[PDB]
Write a protein that binds this ligand. Structure first.
Ligand SMILES: [Zn+2]
Lengths: 64, 95, 97, 103, 78, 80, 105, 91
DNA sequence: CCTTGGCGGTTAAAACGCGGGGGACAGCGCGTACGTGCGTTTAAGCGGTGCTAGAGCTGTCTACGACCAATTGAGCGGCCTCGGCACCGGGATTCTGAT
DNA sequence: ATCAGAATCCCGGTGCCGAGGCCGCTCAATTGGTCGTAGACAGCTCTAGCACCGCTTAAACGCACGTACGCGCTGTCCCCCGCGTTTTAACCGCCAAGG
């Protein structure tokens, strides 16, 4: 079953903190970051061990 | 609190004129407001085209008449032109 | 016992020409529309009244297109619809090239 | 109010205002909004008169929009006017091709 | 996905249309044409909301997009 | 008078052939005339109304252009 | 560059368009970038459709574009045909639509 | 009462530079250009009145060109317009 | 012992199912409307020619319209009532088919 | 035709809820007063719309005649209607890992 989790991460674009939601679909190995404020979305591959800090880390490197 | 618009009370009175013993739903009143909006918009667009195909920028009632009998079909249109013309006479005959 | 075909359909045509309530119910239609918009812009919310507007316009649209398609098939010396009938009606209206 | 001075029911000056803010021309005459308001007034009179007859048919007191769509779809010139028009809670003509009626 | 459209829904669409007898491939063809319809509609609707600089599509923009396709619908403040 | 009957069957034939129509039935021609007539009725009514407000007793090409744009059957070619 | 057309490197008169907007009863005020933007869109549309015009006229060994060429080039496009769906060209005609049921087999 | 003739000549020499044209072809072209200009401008005026913005900048023109033309044409047109904005803004 | 993440419920449109029956599709055979030619008749088209409403085009003076301070009460936001329909069981009736 | 019986219509009934009355505000319609040029109007000029005809000729009309798609019919075969049978798209309450 999918996991819809709220986090305390800051969006890299709109800078609103505590407004990034992480949807981890392990059945298809696809993780999804969403911003509850400005509405952006970032997708990245996840394994079985990953957690909201794993894809949020991949989002920091995808920008820089 | 921003003040919003409706035409509900006006056409409401007109409905009360033509049928005193008749109620109405609120959504239908909104529908009629949208109806007035649409007819007004088509008329006004024909008025702007009247202006630009006449190279003039004044609007009188004559342009409104020719706009209505451009848009609406004949018999209905001529009755409406009659109503508007008699109203023009009754108003502008007095102040 | 068993009824003879065609009858119940026309009886519910006479029933379904009466209530103008929405035929497709809400949640799956909403999911389909959401799964569609997402393709145009991610993280997009929808005013529920706008969703009802989409629902109304879609259902009336399809009903009228069915009416023309049905009259095409009636002209086609048949009673049952075909997909080619929808193609003919759309080719008259001009959606597809 | 000029509407009362025209003996009518639609507010003139609101329409005169909306003609200004619509970029509809550069200048706006005196009695053009009176004529337009009267046009609107007779239009809605005719429409809702047929709607009143539609409520007389079903013996309903409050107007439902189904009455409105029916009265649009009955009259000729009105339906040719509002051909590209649909209404929420509209429905259509109760209509059956009798070639599909059984024998 | 698109398969959330049930068979008796399109049947009810035939019924309010007044259509009697139904074939097979009708269903998938119906879903396709409905899809393309909603595609153009919601595309220019989100275009309106893009110009709105706001994160919710207005019902107003839906109405105006219907006007832009010449599909004028009353009822919901348009 | 009777220029409605000035419509010739070989003209209808030629229109069917550029229209791509192969086989022609006989009950078609006066129906065609009636549809063409109603078309031109609405067209010239609107064009003459545009010229009514023009206060000129002669209708121009531009008038007919504007009127057919009003019907949405809009035709280019002659400016307008 | 004195002229804004040379300041845009384009081929259309911008102040023409700005006066058209002013003598349009379109808005009350008109900014500086919108007329340039719209004129650039116009110039792209001209060049884009004239490409199909050039190939369609070159199909028949004729240096001059005829209206039949333009209608052919439109109908052979997809985006332009759905653009010009309610649109008719003078001296146009339509495409060769010979149905397969018609050829002598 | 100006038509757009030499503008067409210069576009044509920029694209197929060995190509003539008839008179009425130019007439249909200018009919086309005027139609497109009117449709976009009126749609922009709708943008203003639907959005209560008392003037129109280039962003309105971009979204209106999105609203009229479909995808490929729209994206290439947005590209050309922003490039023109860029080169005019630089000097 | 008390406060979370999962782990299992009744219900109502939704998916199978069969069988068949009535409707879709190929053939059959004619046949009578209709392509095609051919000669015969016709009107349209083209080129001049008078030719004149009348549009096309230009000064001008005005009044109606653009625009500005009071004012003000109608139009508008909020509150409050009741009878108008939404559905429910009764009961009656009318389609529909097997007879 | 003809009866039995499904299907629907249609009549009190009550309930509840929003349509409509209502009422106290305030901001745009109003009222009045002051510039101003757009246009209603007078009038000038030359184009072009109209009408007409003579000559040319290609285009329509009528008919002769076969003929072949349009159509009524037929048999047939099949596959949607429909009614029945589960059955799964939506939400409601004690477990046994946490803290
Ligand atoms: Zn963000």
């Amino acid at each position: 079953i999918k996991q819809k989790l709220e986090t305390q991460f800051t969006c890299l674009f709109c800078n609103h903190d505590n407004s990034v939601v992480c949807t981890l679909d392990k059945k298809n190995s696809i993780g999804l970051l969403e911003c509850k404020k400005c509405n952006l979305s970032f997708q990245a591959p996840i394994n079985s061990l990953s957690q909201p800090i794993d894809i949020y880390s991949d989002w920091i490197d995808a920008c820089e | 609190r921003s003040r919003k618009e409706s035409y509900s009370i006006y056409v409401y009175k007109v409905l009360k004129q033509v049928h005193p013993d008749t109620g109405i739903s609120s959504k239908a009143m909104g529908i009629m407001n949208s109806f007035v909006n649409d007819i007004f918009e088509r008329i006004a667009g024909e008025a702007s085209r009247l202006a630009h195909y006449n190279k003039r920028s004044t609007i009188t009632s004559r342009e409104i008449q020719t706009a209505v009998r451009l848009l609406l079909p004949g018999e209905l249109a001529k009755h409406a032109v009659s109503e508007g013309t008699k109203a023009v006479t009754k108003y502008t005959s007095a102040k | 016992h068993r009824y003879r075909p065609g009858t119940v359909a026309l009886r519910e045509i006479r029933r379904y020409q009466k209530s103008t309530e929405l035929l497709i119910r809400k949640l799956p239609f909403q999911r389909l529309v959401r799964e569609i918009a997402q393709d145009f812009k991610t993280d997009l919310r929808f005013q529920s009244a706008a969703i009802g507007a989409l629902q109304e316009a879609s259902e009336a649209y399809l009903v009228g297109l069915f009416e023309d398609t049905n009259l095409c098939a009636i002209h086609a010396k048949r009673v049952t619809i075909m997909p080619k009938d929808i193609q003919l009606a759309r080719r008259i209206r001009g959606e597809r090239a | 109010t000029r509407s009362s001075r025209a003996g009518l029911q639609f507010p003139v000056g609101r329409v005169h205002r909306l003609l200004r803010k619509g970029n509809y021309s550069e200048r706006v005459g005196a009695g053009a909004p009176v004529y337009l308001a009267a046009v609107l007034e007779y239009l809605t009179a005719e429409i809702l008169e047929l709607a009143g007859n539609a409520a007389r048919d079903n013996k309903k007191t409050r107007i439902i929009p189904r009455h409105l769509q029916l009265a649009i779809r009955n009259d000729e010139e009105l339906n040719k006017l509002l051909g590209r028009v649909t209404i929420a809670q509209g429905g259509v003509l109760p209509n059956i091709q009798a070639v599909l009626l059984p024998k | 996905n698109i398969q959330g459209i049930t068979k008796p829904a399109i049947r009810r669409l035939a019924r309010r249309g007044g259509v009697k007898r139904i074939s097979g491939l009708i269903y998938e063809e119906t879903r396709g044409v409905l899809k393309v319809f909603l595609e153009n509609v919601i595309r220019d609707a989100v275009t309106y909301t893009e110009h709105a600089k706001r994160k919710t599509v207005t019902a107003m923009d839906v109405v105006y997009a219907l006007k832009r396709q010449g599909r004028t619908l009353y009822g919901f403040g348009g």
